[PDB]
Every structure is written in structure tokens, then in C-alpha cells.
Design a protein that fits this description.
The protein has about 60 residues and is mostly helical. The chain is about 50% helix and about 0% strand. It contains five helices and no strands.
Amino acid sequence: SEPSLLRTVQQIPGVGKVKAPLLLQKFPSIQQLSNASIGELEQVVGQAVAQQIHAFFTQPR
């Protein structure tokens, strides 16, 4: 019934389900959060990380 893409992406390695709620406070939700500007996600957890989560949801597999 509900879209898992959010519960699916949050499972993305790098985001940090730990920070999910932390970084979310500043962003809508793991839905958009995982898509937060690289500059942010990067200076937030990792340059490559932010670069992965960005391309991760880019191609739904």
C-alpha cells in the first residue's frame, strides 16, 4: 500500500540509519534526505557517501 522506496533507500549504506533521523531533522525524510545536496550529505558523512546515495536512488534496481 505504501511506497517502500523510502524504507528501501534508508537501507542504503552510507546514509547511516543512525543519522537518518538526525540528518532528517534538517531534511524532509529518508526519501528526500537521501537526496539532500551532495555538499551537505558529503560534509555530513562522506564525499563518496553523499555521492553514492545520490546516484543510488538515481537508478532503481
